[PDB]
Scaffold this active site. Structure first.
Site, PDB file in Angstrom:
ATOM      1  CB  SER A 258      -0.027  -0.897   0.876  1.00  0.00           C
ATOM      2  OG  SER A 258       1.076  -1.770   1.022  1.00  0.00           O
TER       3      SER A 258
ATOM      4  CE  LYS B 144       1.489  -3.622  -2.154  1.00  0.00           C
ATOM      5  NZ  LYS B 144       2.040  -3.703  -0.776  1.00  0.00           N
TER       6      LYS B 144
ATOM      7  CB  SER C  87       1.566  -3.852   3.455  1.00  0.00           C
ATOM      8  OG  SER C  87       2.174  -2.831   4.229  1.00  0.00           O
TER       9      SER C  87
END
Ligand SMILES: [Zn+2]
Lengths: 86, 468
Positions: free
Chosen positions: B140, B65, B164
């Site tokens: 996310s 990420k 997330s």
RNA sequence: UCCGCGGUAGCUCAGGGUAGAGCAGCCGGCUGUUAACCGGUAGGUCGCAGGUUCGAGUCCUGCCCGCGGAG
């Protein structure tokens, strides 16, 4: 319970400059959100837990080379980070 | 499939270089449409793939990420403020994977600063769900999930603050673990809610999650909040209770979509034929936790994102003044960020601190308590990761409507409790996820209990369009 | 210092088009009232000083005062 004045105050404290369009928009959002949150019930709280934190030894650890540090800077000058003047 | 690859590699059947070339091609051909990766590990991949001993993770490549620091690679955090930022240091978690033969494929797309639940708040571009190009991959960590489901990568790292990592994993039909707060290091995580943030693993199989965690987790002298608890994950060589007590949360039973309720009932039948004592329990103030979260998290976020003025490393907005530059640079934030940090400033602002922050703090302590009490009567807890499957783009862009996506997942963070989202079936063509969580420090429990389920069922994992 | 409610008869509080009602006061009525009540009547710096409006107690700018609240 949120006045356009508070928004101004808040955007001031947060140093965030939004457009008059966004202000009117965010003004509506913040209202709804602050209402949702305000629904939170109040509750009693107990003893502040046991302290189990640790400390670091006073032993030196290699630093960044000046070159690598200044490479992040948008502006540098003679080994310094350069910013607009106060 | 991850452990399968490392197997073929160790037997000389394949070389790490081969595996990279394979995945790199797949990305170059599929990512354009998917939009999973922001950055790619340049020549430094092929070069790095041809100097590795047959180490535990040699042949493996990981998709990270883009809010996790990787030395020498562009770490934007999905923001304009950092769209050219390249860390001179490496995140502890990532560093450890590297020392075991692993390599970074690229950096994954996310909502700006991790604040988002659909990837529609990435400063660069949205990410598409491999199961349906018309629907979001969640957020996310939407990018990491999307990458896995399309076999763009064997392993993946995500970030969880309010789900997330779980919510995206559910939407994309893969596994996502939020580590018990303190298991994995936060050093190198461009985090937004310090008390709630945690790097979480994700993969297409539970055995793979074990690989990641076993490598990534562990005490870090740089993180003062890290726990001194040896991973020991890969000991999923089951001597598993039989007979664990499983508690279903009533509050999370109503309001679910057909496919979620259906997937839930079926899962219960499975855990029962496995030797578990399924019973309904009560998470009294769980439904009111979403509120406490959106006052505690924004609070810490305002203070964490305060550092992003154009002085030392961000983008400079070119004001030509003193404060006017800082004020103009921060204007580069997105609508969602601004929204949250404005809330955060208010909740901590004078006259409102005790009325809000102090209030939410006391409430956060209730949840931990109610949880302690629940794990005195049960060994595991079950609920949906989300009331519905992935939604279509445009659907849910209302401040509050977006916040409710993390309804079921917020509790894990406020408490620190480990939680795992696992593919529990479908409803149509869209994957559905179930959330299984345990008491603190018992992360491995969760894993083995899910190995049981992953096995008792052949597989509820579909590979939308995947291949070596 | 900041913030949020207040300031209207004497007292306690009602509310973009004579500024009002009950308590008491005045006049009239009633031999058992307990905060008597019935009719009539008198009673004003609507906070103060500046604006919008044809018209401001009502809206909007500043100040004085009171109460309450914040780590
Ligand atoms: Zn230092």
């Amino acid at each position: 319970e949120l006045s356009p004045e508070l928004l101004r105050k808040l955007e001031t404290l947060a140093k965030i400059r939004l457009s008059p369009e966004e202000e009117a928009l965010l003004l509506q959002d913040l209202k709804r959100i602050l209402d949702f949150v305000d629904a939170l019930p109040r509750v009693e709280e107990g003893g502040a837990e046991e302290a189990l934190g640790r400390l670091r030894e006073d032993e030196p650890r290699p630093s960044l080379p000046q070159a690598e540090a200044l490479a992040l800077a948008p502006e540098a000058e003679d080994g310094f980070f350069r910013v607009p003047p106060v | 499939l991850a452990h399968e690859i490392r197997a073929r590699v160790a037997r000389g059947e394949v070389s790490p270089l081969e595996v990279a070339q394979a995945y790199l091609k797949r990305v170059q051909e599929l990512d354009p449409g998917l939009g999973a990766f922001l950055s790619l590990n340049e020549r430094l991949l092929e070069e790095a793939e041809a100097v590795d001993p047959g180490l535990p993770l040699a042949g493996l490549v990981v998709a990270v990420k883009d809010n996790i620091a990787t030395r020498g690679l562009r770490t934007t955090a999905g923001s304009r403020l950092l769209e050219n930022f390249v860390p001179p240091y490496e995140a502890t978690a990532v560093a450890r994977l590297k020392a075991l033969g692993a390599l970074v494929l690229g950096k994954t797309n996310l909502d700006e600063f991790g604040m988002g639940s659909s990837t529609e708040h990435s400063a660069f571009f949205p990410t598409k769900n491999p199961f349906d190009p018309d629907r979001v991959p969640g957020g996310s960590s939407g990018g990491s999930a999307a990458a896995l489901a399309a076999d763009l990568a064997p392993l993946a790292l995500g970030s969880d603050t309010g789900g997330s990592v779980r919510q995206p994993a559910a939407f994309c039909g893969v596994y996502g673990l939020k580590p018990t707060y303190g298991r994995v290091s936060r050093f190198g995580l461009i985090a937004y809610a310090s008390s709630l943030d945690q790097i979480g693993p994700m993969a297409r199989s539970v055995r793979d999650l074990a690989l990641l965690m076993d490598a990534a987790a562990g005490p870090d002298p740089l993180d003062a909040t890290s726990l001194d608890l040896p991973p020991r994950f890969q000991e999923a060589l089951e001597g598993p209770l039989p007979p664990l007590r499983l508690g279903v949360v009533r509050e999370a039973l109503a309001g679910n979509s057909p496919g979620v309720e259906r997937a839930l009932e079926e899962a219960l039948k499975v855990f029962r034929e496995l030797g578990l004592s399924v019973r309904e329990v009560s998470w009294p103030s769980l439904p009111q936790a979403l509120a406490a979260y959106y006052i505690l998290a924004p609070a810490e976020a305002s203070s964490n994102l305060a550092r992003y003025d154009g002085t030392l490393y961000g983008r400079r907005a070119a004001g030509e003044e003193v404060e006017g530059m800082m004020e103009a640079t921060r204007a580069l934030f997105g609508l969602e960020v601004k929204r949250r940090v404005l809330v955060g400033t208010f909740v901590l602002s004078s006259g409102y601190y005790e009325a809000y922050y102090g209030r939410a703090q006391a409430f956060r302590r209730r949840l931990k308590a109610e949880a302690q009490a629940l794990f005195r009567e049960v060994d595991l807890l079950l609920l949906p990761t989300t009331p519905h499957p992935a939604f279509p783009f445009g659907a849910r862009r209302d401040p509050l409507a977006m916040y409710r996506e993390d309804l079921y997942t917020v509790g894990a963070n406020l408490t620190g409790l480990p939680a795992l989202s696992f593919p529990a079936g479908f409803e149509g063509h869209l994957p559905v996820g179930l959330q299984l969580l345990a008491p603190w420090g018992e992360d491995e429990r969760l894993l083995r209990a899910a190995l049981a389920f992953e096995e008792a069922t052949a597989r509820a994992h579909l590979k939308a369009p995947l291949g070596e």
